[PDB]
Every structure is written in C-alpha cells, then in structure tokens.
Amino acid sequence: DKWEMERTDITMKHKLGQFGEVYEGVWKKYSLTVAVKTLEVEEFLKEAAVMKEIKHPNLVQLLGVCTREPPFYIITEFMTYGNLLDYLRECNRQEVSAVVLLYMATQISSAMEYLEKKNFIHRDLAARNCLVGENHLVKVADFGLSRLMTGDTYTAHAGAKFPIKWTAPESLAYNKFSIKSDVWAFGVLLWEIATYGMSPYPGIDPSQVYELLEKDYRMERPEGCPEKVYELMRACWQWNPSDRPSFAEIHQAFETMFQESSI
Numbered sequence: 001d002k003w004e005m006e007r008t009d010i011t012m013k014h015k016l017g018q019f020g021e022v023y024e025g026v027w028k029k030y031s032l033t034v035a036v037k038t039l040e041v042e043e044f045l046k047e048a049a050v051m052k053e054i055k056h057p058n059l060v061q062l063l064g065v066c067t068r069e070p071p072f073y074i075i076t077e078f079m080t081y082g083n084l085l086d087y088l089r090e091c092n093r094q095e096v097s098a099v100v101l102l103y104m105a106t107q108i109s110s111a112m113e114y115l116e117k118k119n120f121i122h123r124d125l126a127a128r129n130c131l132v133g134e135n136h137l138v139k140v141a142d143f144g145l146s147r148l149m150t151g152d153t154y155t156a157h158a159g160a161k162f163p164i165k166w167t168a169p170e171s172l173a174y175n176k177f178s179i180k181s182d183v184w185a186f187g188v189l190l191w192e193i194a195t196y197g198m199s200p201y202p203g204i205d206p207s208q209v210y211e212l213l214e215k216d217y218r219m220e221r222p223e224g225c226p227e228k229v230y231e232l233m234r235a236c237w238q239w240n241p242s243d244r245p246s247f248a249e250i251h252q253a254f255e256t257m258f259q260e261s262s263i
C-alpha cells in the first residue's frame with residue numbers, strides 16, 4: 001500500500017528505553033526527524049495495521065511501515081518534548097499555567113472522543129503515554145490501540161499485570177476492559193495533570209488500592225485544581241462503568257472550560 005516503505009529510507013540517529021525498541025530516526029528524503037518502533041511478530045504487525053486507520057490531530061500520526069521482511073519498522077512523527085509526565089514535572093509552571101493545563105486536557109479528551117467514535121480502546125492511558133510537541137501540543141501514544149465496539153468488553157489474558165493506580169476496579173477484579181475503563185484511567189490522567197506529574201495515591205501500596213476503591217475512597221482534590229475539573233475526575237471514578245461519562249461529554253466540558261478561561 002501507500003504506507004509500505006523501504007528500510008533504507010530511514011537512518012537511525014539515537015535510541016530513545018521505557019517504550020521498548022524505539023529510536024529517533026531520519027527520513028532522509030525529507031530531512032525529517034521521525035520516531036521508529038522496531039521488533040511477538042503478529043501482534044506488532046497488527047499494531048501497524050490499526051495505526052493506518054488512525055487520523056486525528058491529537059493521536060500520534062503514522063508515517064510509514066516496513067512489514068515485508070524483518071526487521072520490521074513502524075515509523076511515526078517525532079514529538080520533540082517527549083512524554084507528558086516528565087514534561088509536567090520539569091516545566092516552567094508560569095508558562096505551563098492553569099489555562100495550558102485545560103488546553104492539554106481538552107486535547108487528550110478530543111483524541112479519546114475520536115477513539116470512542118471509531119470503536120477503538122486504549123487500555124493504557126496515563127501521562128507517561130502522552131507525548132508533547134511545540135506550543136503545548138499533546139498527542140496520545142497510539143501504538144497499542146485495539147479494535148473493540150464501543151460498549152463491548154475485553155477479558156485480559158490469565159496472569160496479566162496492570163498499572164494498578166490507573167486501572168478501573170472492574171479490570172482489577174475481573175480483568176474486564178471497555179471504553180469506560182479508559183474513562184477511569186483518564187480521570188487518573190487528569191489528576192496527574194492537575195498535580196504537574198505527582199504519582200497517584202501517594203504512599204499507598206498498589207496491593208491495597210482496590211479495597212479502598214470498594215470503600216468509596218478516592219483521591220482528594222489537588223491544590224489549585226478547580227472544583228469543576230475535580231467533579232469530572234470523580235465522575236470518571238464512579239464504581240459502576242455505566243455511570244461514568246462518555247469522552248464526548250468530557251471533551252465538551254473541557255472545550256467549554258478552555259474557551260471560557262481564554263475569555
């Protein structure tokens with residue numbers, strides 16, 4: 001297809017390794033700095049297939065694939081400032097102000113509304129899996145997206161391990177994932193943003209989080225976080241998946257807040 005590329009079109013500059021086999025590269029023809037994911041086989045090739053169907057300003061854009069013979073490449077745009085978590089921790093808070101925080105939440109929710117619309121599920125939404133470009137542009141990392149009709153559920157493989165503090169209670173107890181477990185994770189992401197990259201449930205060991213969530217314990221409102229934003233967080237953390245808002249509802253709320261904060 002139009003996506004298929006020659007391996008020799010790209011030269012690798014620097015290895016980037018929390019994301020795995022991921023490199024900074026050069027698309028020589030365009031003098032363009034790119035990101036390259038290299039390599040099981042069938043899972044990797046499906047990743048590439050799904051990414052061909054993703055087209056949104058706030059999801060990392062696929063540029064090309066090398067899938068004919070090993071070693072296999074997935075080539076995407078390069079996000080200059082790296083992951084959002086480290087970006088928030090290291091930022092100038094006078095530059096990355098409250099309105100900027102709303103702007104980033106609006107961008108992420110836009111991408112998630114798109115996935116909700118297009119029957120995709122993320123399953124690993126967190127600040128570490130969002131990427132930052134110039135001028136506070138934020139894009140959701142989309143290399144591990146899966147096909148799932150919005151409303152349907154996925155049952156994780158036996159012995160699966162999750163990032164507990166981002167993981168919805170139905171996922172923790174029953175290994176069940178849906179768009180609503182993404183909504184839960186987004187709530188935790190909101191908290192990460194509001195705190196400029198604090199670790200969620202600070203001091204609480206992961207193995208004790210589920211029992212607390214049962215008892216209706218939730219994280220308290222972060223310092224300086226608007227009540228409207230915290231109410232959205234808490235709506236995302238509703239015990240019953242069906243009681244949580246949709247990303248369409250969430251995006252509309254943030255877009256309104258961002259427009260009002262600008263005016």
Ligand SMILES: CCn1nccc1-c1c[nH]c2ncc(-c3ccc(N)c(C(=O)N(C)C)c3)cc12
Binds near residue numbers: 060083086
């Ligand atoms: C498919 C390729 N891929 N797999 C995972 C992420 C990306 C990626 C795509 N586009 C990217 N654009 C930029 C970066 C990037 C750049 C600099 C950085 N310091 C970091 C960073 O946060 N650290 C801690 C290594 C991340 C990663 C990706």
